[PDB]
Design a binder for this molecule. Structure first.
Ligand SMILES: [Mg+2]
Lengths: 192, 188
C-alpha cells in the first residue's frame, strides 16, 4: 500500500516539476494534483528538495551505470559512441520527466550543497564521452580535423534536447530517433 | 543610457531568470534607483519584449534574405546556421532568454509572435531542407521531419557555454558544427 503510494506521489511531483519548473512548483501544487493536502505528502517525504533528489538520482544512477559499463564493455569506438547516445535516447523515453528536469530545470541546483553530485556527474560525463572521442580519433574511427572539445560540447548540448518534443508511447520510437541522430552526426546530412 | 540599462536587464534575465528578477534587482545592478528605471521603461515585461524583438527582428530579417539570396542548398543551410551562431555572439543574453527563459510566456497573449516565429522558422528552414533533398544536396534516406527537428532543437544550445572573447571565435564553432552535421564525425 504505502510504498506504491509513495512512488505514485513522486511520479506526480516529477511530472509537475518537468512541466512548471522546480522553483515554480510548490508542495501544495503536488498535493492538489494527488488529491490530498500537503500534510499527507510530508508523511511520505521530508521535503520538496528530497523529492527532487530522489527523482534525479533514480534516473542518473541508472544512466551513468549504463554509460560506465558501455565504455568498459570492449565495443569499438564508433559502436561505443552509438551505444552511449542510444542509452540517452532510451532514458528520454523511460524517464521523460526526470530528463526534462535534468535538461531544463537544474541550473540553479548548483548553488545547493545537496546537489554537488550534479557537478561531479558533469565532470564525469565529459571524461567518459570526450574520452571515447579521443580514443576514436587516435584509432582512426573519427576525423582528425574536428576539435574534440567542440565535438564533445556538441554531443553534451544535444543529448537531451529532444525531451522538449518527444512523446513516450508515440508511433515514433525513440530508437528511430536515435538512429537518425546518429546517422547525421556520424555520417552527415549531405549526400556522399 | 536606456540601451545600457536594457543590456544590464538582459544579463540578469539570462543569469537569474525572468521570474527571479525584480525591478529593484535591475536597478541595483545598474547602480541606479528604481524610479530612474521607470523613466525609461514602464515594466519588466516591456523590457523582455524589447530585448526579444530586437534580437528576433534582426535574425529573421537575415534568414529571409538568405533564403531569397539564390545560394545552392548546402550553402543556404550553412549561411542560416552561421547567422544563428553570430546572434549567439552578438546577442548572447537575448538568445539565452529566448532558448531557456520564456517557456512560461509562449501561451501569453502579448508574446504571440513567438509562435508565429516557430511557424516562420519552419517555413524557411524546412523549405531549404526539402529543396536540398529534392536537388540531391542532402540525403534522400533521412526522415526530413526528424532532420528539421534536429536543426531546430540544436540552433541555440551552445548559448549555455559560448561567450564572446573565448579562445576561438563563434565562426570557428559554427564551421565545426556544420562540418559534423553535414559531413559527419566519422572518418571517410
Ligand atoms: Mg512539454
Amino acid at each position: 500500500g504505502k510504498s506504491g503510494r509513495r512512488t505514485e506521489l513522486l511520479d506526480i511531483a516529477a511530472t509537475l516539476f518537468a512541466e512548471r519548473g522546480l522553483r515554480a512548483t510548490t508542495v501544495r501544487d503536488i498535493a492538489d494534483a494527488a488529491g490530498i493536502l500537503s500534510g499527507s505528502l510530508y508523511h511520505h517525504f521530508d521535503s520538496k528538495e528530497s523529492m527532487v533528489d530522489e527523482i534525479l538520482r533514480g534516473f542518473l544512477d541508472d544512466l551513468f551505470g549504463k554509460y560506465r559499463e558501455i565504455v568498459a564493455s570492449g565495443l569499438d569506438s564508433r559502436a561505443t559512441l552509438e551505444a552511449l547516445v542510444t542509452t540517452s535516447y532510451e532514458a528520454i523515453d523511460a524517464s521523460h520527466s526526470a530528463v526534462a528536469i535534468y535538461q531544463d530545470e537544474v541550473k540553479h541546483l548548483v548553488a545547493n550543497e545537496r546537489f554537488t553530485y550534479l557537478s561531479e556527474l558533469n565532470t564525469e560525463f565529459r571524461e567518459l564521452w570526450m574520452g571515447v572521442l579521443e580514443a576514436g580519433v587516435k584509432d582512426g574511427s573519427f576525423r582528425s580535423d574536428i576539435d574534440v572539445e567542440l565535438a564533445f560540447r556538441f554531443l553534451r548540448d544535444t543529448a537531451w534536447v529532444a525531451v522538449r518534443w518527444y512523446r513516450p508511447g508515440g508511433s515514433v520510437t525513440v530508437d528511430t530517433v536515435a538512429k537518425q541522430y546518429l546517422s547525421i552526426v556520424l555520417d552527415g546530412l549531405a549526400s556522399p
